[PDB]
Each structure stands twice: as structure tokens, then as C-alpha cells.
Amino acid sequence: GSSGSSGASRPHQWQTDEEGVRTGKCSFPVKYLGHVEVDESRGMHICEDAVKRLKATGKKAVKAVLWVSADGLRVVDEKTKDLIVDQTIEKVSFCAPDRNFDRAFSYICRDGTTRRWICHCFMAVKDTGERLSHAVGCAFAACLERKQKRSGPSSG
């Protein structure tokens, strides 16, 4: 009894990510662009500026599954399902969608090596940043929830 995993089709599209974030199965096929530096650390236009950055950095993406959890995220390596990166919702300061590419999602977070702010980007595989913005925004709301307060019952 640890957590385990198991991917499979689902009815919902976004809501499904709202559960996998609480239950433990909110992962989808995406690509890892990388992490870029920021200045403001907050700006829906920033995230975008990030992608572009990596788009000008002349690099490549990695084929991995982006996991989303209240604890944050987890860039698993489809290779052996290993762990490529481990991001925590905490650090994640902001996360905004995109509106230029086909599926380019990014989010700001406080670096955990130096002493600055870093932004991450992920090129969805067969999805759109929006959805990714939901999952990321799902965990956040969840994590936040614990801190924040909830009005009226909302089980589902």
C-alpha cells in the first residue's frame, strides 16, 4: 500500500484530472520543454514568453507523462515510468494557459537550487494547454483548499 498507478480511458476530460489530482491518477501525455528564468514571476503573458524562450533556445522536448497531484506535479519518463522531475504545487506561484501554439503550457515556480524564480513549460502530446491548466489549477485549488476555506458541501 503506497499509491500505485494505472492509466485507462475515461469519460470526463477535465474533471477526470480533478480526481487524479486527489485520488492519484491525473497524468497525461505531454512533452518536457524545460525550465526558463523569469523576472516578474507572475504574468499570463510570462508563461508564453517562456515557451518562446525555449522556442528560441533551439532545443527539443522529451516524451514523458505529466503527472498532476495536490503535492504538485511529477514528470515521469515514459521510458520506465521513472521520475524525470518532481515539482511541488507550493513553489508553483502562478500557472496560466497559452494562446498561440497548439498545446504549450507553462507555469512559474520558485527555483529550488539557486535563489530565484523559474518557469516550466510542457508541450502537450494530444491535448491542449488549457486542460493542463486545469490539472495544474486543480492541484493548486486542492492544495490551497487545505489552507483556504470551502463554502457549502461539494462532494459530487
Side-chain angles (χ1 to χ4, degrees), residues 12-117:
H12 287 113
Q13 174 70 280
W14 296 46
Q15 159 143 244
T16 174
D17 291 343
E18 185 155 87
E19 305 202 301
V21 63
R22 43 174 229 85
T23 73
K25 46 84 170 300
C26 176
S27 73
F28 21 104
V30 325
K31 282 120 84 137
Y32 184 26
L33 299 162
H35 39 224
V36 304
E37 258 99 22
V38 304
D39 215 271
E40 313 274 306
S41 207
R42 61 99 113 187
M44 299 139 269
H45 64 266
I46 310 278
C47 301
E48 269 82 278
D49 238 33
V51 189
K52 289 113 128 283
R53 221 185 218 284
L54 307 152
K55 241 151 230 249
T57 215
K59 224 159 82 165
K60 290 209 177 218
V62 170
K63 287 230 84 170
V65 174
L66 164 49
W67 296 69
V68 195
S69 302
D71 268 318
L73 331 149
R74 270 223 202 73
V75 182
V76 154
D77 193 333
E78 280 222 299
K79 195 177 191 138
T80 193
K81 274 295 204 254
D82 233 357
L83 199 271
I84 311 168
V85 170
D86 157 77
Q87 177 79 56
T88 163
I89 217 67
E90 304 309 278
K91 298 317 204 240
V92 176
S93 210
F94 186 43
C95 45
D98 62 289
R99 50 211 113 195
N100 300 300
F101 318 86
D102 279 38
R103 63 216 153 194
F105 160 71
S106 159
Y107 72 70
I108 312 190
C109 69
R110 184 229 277 294
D111 198 0
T113 39
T114 293
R115 35 139 63 184
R116 68 168 325 91
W117 309 75

Side-chain angles (χ1 to χ4, degrees), residues 145 149-156:
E145 240 226 67
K149 65 86 160 132
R150 178 109 246 170
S151 184
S154 55
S155 295

